Amino acid sequence: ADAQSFLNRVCGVSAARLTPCGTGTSTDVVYRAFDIYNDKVAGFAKFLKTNCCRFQEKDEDDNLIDSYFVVKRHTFSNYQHEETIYNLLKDCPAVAKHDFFKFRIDGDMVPHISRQRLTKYTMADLVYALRHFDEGNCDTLKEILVTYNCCDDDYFNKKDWYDFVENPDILRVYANLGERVRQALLKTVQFCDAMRNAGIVGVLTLDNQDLNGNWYDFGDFIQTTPGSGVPVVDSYYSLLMPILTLTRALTAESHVDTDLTKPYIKWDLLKYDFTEERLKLFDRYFKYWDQTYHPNCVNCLDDRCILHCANFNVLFSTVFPPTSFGPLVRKIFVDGVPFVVSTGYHFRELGVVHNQDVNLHSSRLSFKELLVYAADPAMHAASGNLLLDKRTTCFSVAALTNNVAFQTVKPGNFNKDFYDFAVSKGFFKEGSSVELKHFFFAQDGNAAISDYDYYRYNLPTMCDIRQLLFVVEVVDKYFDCYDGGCINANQVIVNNLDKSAGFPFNKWGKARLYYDSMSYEDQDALFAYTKRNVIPTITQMNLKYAISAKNRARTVAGVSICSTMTNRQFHQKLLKSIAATRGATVVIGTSKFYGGWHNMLKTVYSDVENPHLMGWDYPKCDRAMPNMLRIMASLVLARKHTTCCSLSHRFYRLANECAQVLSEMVMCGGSLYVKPGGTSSGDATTAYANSVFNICQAVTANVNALLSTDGNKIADKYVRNLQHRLYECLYRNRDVDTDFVNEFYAYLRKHFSMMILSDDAVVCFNSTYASQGLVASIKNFKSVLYYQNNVFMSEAKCWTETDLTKGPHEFCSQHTMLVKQGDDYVYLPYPDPSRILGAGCFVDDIVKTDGTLMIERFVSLAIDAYPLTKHPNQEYADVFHLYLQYIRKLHDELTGHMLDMYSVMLTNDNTSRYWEPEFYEAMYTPHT
Amino acid sequence: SKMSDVKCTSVVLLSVLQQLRVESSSKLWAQCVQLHNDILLAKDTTEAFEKMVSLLSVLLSMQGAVDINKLCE
Amino acid sequence: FSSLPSYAAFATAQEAYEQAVANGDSEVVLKKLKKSLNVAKSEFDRDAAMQRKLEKMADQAMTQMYKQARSEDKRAKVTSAMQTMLFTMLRKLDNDALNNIINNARDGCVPLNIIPLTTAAKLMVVIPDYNTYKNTCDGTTFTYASALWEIQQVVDADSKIVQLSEISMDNSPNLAWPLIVTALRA
Amino acid sequence: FSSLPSYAAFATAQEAYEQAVANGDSEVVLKKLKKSLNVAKSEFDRDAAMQRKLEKMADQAMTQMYKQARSEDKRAKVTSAMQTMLFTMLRKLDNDALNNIINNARDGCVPLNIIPLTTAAKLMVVIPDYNTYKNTCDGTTFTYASALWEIQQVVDADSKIVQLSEISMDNSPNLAWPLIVTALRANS
């Protein structure tokens, strides 16, 4: 039999019992992921291969195991070429065994190349399954997880088994892969060491390597003088990078012999600088990565190199003990007495940074030095007690008091008069469309520590370096139209000086006290001081007493006065210019009254073809945010400063922002904890940085959507060329191509138009391109969030709309409707009626319950009520009239009360206009 | 409008309990808070009424804190 | 702003000027009348503005004192208002279980613990007098919060354990009322 | 005010005009006297208006000076409070062990986080449930942070003292969790 003879030859001299998978001599059909760059296509995409025959090996018990034999049928010149290269490479242990033989297929002679003991799947399959997460790819991910003993098959019957938030145990499941990944890394370096010595020039791609780490596919390679060969590895490492942190390979480095069975390394407790160990790790794993790596970002040349080196540092820092990542302290003398003060920071991201203006001996302390020494946590933590808190997994530094504090939240007050009036009018009946949903929920003493423990979701994350470096330029294209720079202290504007100054300054007064005490010279001296030295600060957590639809507690972070002053002085000129602009993508500072909403909606609709609307939500947004994207947002904001600040000043400003906002010391209940990362509530820049992060996420989704598409099926030649140039710009080019950045920005603005405000976004997109795969959609956002943020975006929360006459389903908690006004049609926003009725019924202070004073309070609530009149639902319309009639009743009661008490009537009657409708109608007419 | 009345009465009852220094006992305060939030979230009336019965039993147990006979008259 | 001291002169000057123009009198007389009208009107407007200022100040004073007095009145009496409102709403609810527990508490039959929601959980109650026992209790069963319970243990003020049979009208003086009862939910 | 000399000159003109009107002098004399009187009135009004302007300017300057004095007083008070807090914290800390560890360091710098671990004399542990207590703090002495600690009396969530004999599996529902245990560092 011909098939049996072919199988017998395929078996060769090995003792491998082979199983004839496929059918006889026929080529097998498989669907697999490939990284590819040809003269006509360039992609990282799933393909149907149909190129080789495959057989399986069975154990001594004749059951099947994960070990395959693959034989390829191809041209004779390729046969000789691969034979020569393999004969060169034979000595390396990282190369799979190859055989070459000729066989009678057509009656004539055909050559075959065979390789042995391959796994079912390659590294590219694992990377694609994790990076492009969806249920179809889940079917492959399950097989990969089951085959290598990560988990048993029943595990996938759990609800939400994939969810990082609802099923944190999944993080334990992935870690088992990590060691198998690490062996893949070392093998790769070994392979390069052979390829250079043999004298070979070739590119490495993920698809060539199996899950045991062995390599094949020599056909692409060409020869060169021995000792001068080069590997090209950019795409391989860049694609692999997120998986490295997701699976946590370098955890194996933690142990003494690097054996997972040996005990942990016990470092010197006082050690704080690990530069040699970082260099050793980089040289071991990333030997042939051809770009200069700086362990300490202070040396870096520019913001892109800062991003590159911080991306490496975040991976490397996980190995080192948690106690070393903190501010460094030193002893100094003042007037003969010893102080302990801070002198530097050790960042997981930015390495070891030292201050430049330290004094070992001093005679006196000025006001600025007193502020600096009181602000930083060195004294409080050194004097305080030792704390071991079992309520949180987060690291805890010290306890400042002998007693811990438990803080409750009280319920809201009931405005019975308005409720009785509404019930008399006829609201709140069973079966009504309007009902109470927003309340003042109470909290027990455990609220603050639980909401802090919510920070546990933040995990280390290593981003795709090249993709991120392209996306940051695309975002800078979005932001480039504003102006910014530094200003002197006299120019800055403060909204409210009766707000808290943070810890410990709140002990002595509000911010007004510190703004009064310091002359402009002191503030400018402090701001100039921050440009040369790092100032750590303490942040306080507060519980917010406010109406909500959900019963979970909400905390907000107050930042110390020094950080607030210097951050205001640094960022305010750019932030005010962002607020001033109209018609931009970032829509902060635009009002909804006087026709603003219609203008915004008309702006977002501009010039798209075949349009649809869609919007999404980031779960756990502020807690989950990776540190790298916050650094990127800070650098994007710093880019405007290039005219006025040298590189060193900007690096020290970034270090200050990292020490104060990103990973500072958080004071909760009288105890100090370390914040693992993420956004803080009081940055003085929080909303704009959130907008930058939002735009970056959308652009990354678009890039993934365009690159994943099979380039053979795209009909438009222009889009094929754009995809080819996109792959070239990302993985196979070094310096920034400004022309292609402008071209991609124009493509995005034409086909995919956004409207952004913090973590809320609306986008109008070309449905035909979205269906073909040339622009992003909800699926790509889900995958991008899953691998980058480490959160699963519940699709039920997202929304999409097909009819533009109905507008967005939700923006800033407003619903949109189309109405006639004159002979024109306009868009109007209206709120959820439950919110308005609850704001009427429940108040946060007792005095508010009395209506007569609160007449002015009700008028504002009537304004938001006005659009509800346009609604076709009668129950919604009744609310506004209810508010007007309550205003009328309140005025009557006030007149009666004053007539009774003082016996003299009032002499001003402006309030008469308030209960009549026309005034409220003025609020939304575009006339002025 | 029974259910809305029940929820408003839960708000008023928890405010009355809070003014009565119930917070000093953390265990009892936690139970009261759980009852209050559960009544606010509830969707069908009989569950709200039973939870209200427990929450009112909390107030009634405090002998001499409120003159029930004087208040109800 | 009316009937002010300068109003009469202004009104009479305007009337005289209007009569003069109606007659067609001498131009110089008309101009003299018009200038007298203008000076009278200037004085009238000046004192009117002063009266406006006085009115505004009085209005502001009255409004501020009303606000302060009523804020103090609302703030001082919060506790009694809260309790009265609570019991008013409780009566308005008109539920059998709430009324049962409230009326029992009014008679002194208060519970010692939170009334449990679930089967076979433990409740403890105080019984002031044999009459309330006769009303609430029947043999081995107890009726409370519109629910049926099963008696577990009866105790006395001196912690003596009392058997259910002992509680009778004739024997009642012997016991040191009030009694404590423990029950489970059926 | 009537004491102004320009008002006095205006008053002399006013008396002249009133006498002329009472006597019934001719219109031409009345016109010339009227223009003289109106010159006097213009002088009086101009001086009064400039007096108003000067007085309000003086009031504004005085208010600015008063505000500055209050600001200086506040600055002095804040400086005193800051100095007192800093020196109290200086006196509180244990100099001997901190000096020993800082002298041991390679560069004189040490991480902040290790200072409470090494030097602190008193420890606090917050425990949410009985299993955690049994694991972490069973007994009157326990080892943490590579050191041996002996126990001082415990307080509950109500900050009332709990005896160590009470903390047991059967009794656990009665207590008001979490529990706060405090401890001192053993000499060895």
Add this chain to the structure above:
RNA sequence: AAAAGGGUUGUGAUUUUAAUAGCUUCUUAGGAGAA
């Protein structure tokens, strides 16, 4: 009761001030008319 109460934008009402604008007052010069 103590304690503590963040960043950013928009909106309404009240009081104060400044600058334009309109009007009244009456002082000064020039032109015209009449004697």
Add this chain to the structure above:
RNA sequence: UUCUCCUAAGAAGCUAUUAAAAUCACAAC
């Protein structure tokens, strides 16, 4: 030389609007 009329400048008083500060309240991420 004297009277009447107009134009122009200065100084006061009233009023309409626009724009800046302070206080209270409302809404959104």
